[PDB]
């Protein structure tokens, strides 16, 4: 509620880079007089709940793949996946494991999660070869090609990414029967942060 609301103000998710992009006008609140955009974060929180309700609908959690190609997204995606039932792909994305049926990696999902579409674009491309819905953590200048649910966040930030995955995992856990809404959590956020 209001405590969860205060929990995300402090981190630096709200700031988004330059290159405003056209498809994120509704997701940006304005550009600061310095020249750096900022995100409403109310839409971020709401779209966060909504993406979690997307994810929870998958009966087999192992059919959700969260990918990352950034050094400080790898810890977040790995530990979010191991908290939930999803299975992650950090580091380099082999450019064939969604369309090639012979390579040993494969492991096609029913749902994909992307930390940043611009850096993980290859997986986004492969998704449109096998009908993977794709949910992406898009920021001010991230392209929206083959992106269905985009939450407006910041992808460059260490703490921004860590907190974003923290609330994602927390909210899907609430959606599950694991924990009631009113209980205050016990897993602390900085454990997601890249050292």
């Amino acid at each position: 509620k209001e405590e969860s609301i205060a929990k995300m103000l402090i981190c630096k998710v709200h700031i988004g880079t330059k290159n405003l992009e056209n498809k994120m006008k509704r997701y940006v609140y304005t550009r600061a007089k310095d020249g750096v955009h900022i995100i409403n974060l109310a839409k971020t929180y709401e779209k966060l709940q909504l993406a979690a309700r997307i994810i929870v609908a998958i009966s087999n959690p192992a059919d959700v793949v969260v990918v990352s190609a950034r050094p400080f997204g790898s810890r977040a995606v790995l530990k979010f996946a191991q908290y939930t039932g999803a299975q992650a792909i950090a580091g380099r994305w082999t450019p064939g494991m969604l369309t090639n049926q012979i390579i040993q990696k494969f492991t096609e999902p029913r749902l994909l999660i992307v930390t940043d579409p611009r850096t993980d674009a290859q997986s986004v491309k492969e998704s449109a070869y096998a009908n993977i819905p794709v949910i992406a953590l898009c920021d001010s200048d991230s392209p929206l090609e083959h992106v269905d649910i985009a939450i407006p966040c910041n992808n460059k930030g260490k703490e921004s990414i860590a907190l974003m995955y923290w609330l994602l995992a927390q909210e899907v856990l609430y959606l599950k029967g694991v924990i009631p809404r009113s209980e205050p959590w016990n897993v602390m956020v900085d454990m997601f942060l890249w050292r």
Partner: peptide
């Protein structure tokens, strides 16, 4: 992949900008 990174795993384990205030006052 052996036990030489496991213990490292647990070792690893363990006002504001003017626009944003009016922003939050607008939001609630």
């Amino acid at each position: 992949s052996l036990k030489l990174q496991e213990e490292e795993r647990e070792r690893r384990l363990d006002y504001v900008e003017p626009d944003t205030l009016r922003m939050i006052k607008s939001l609630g």
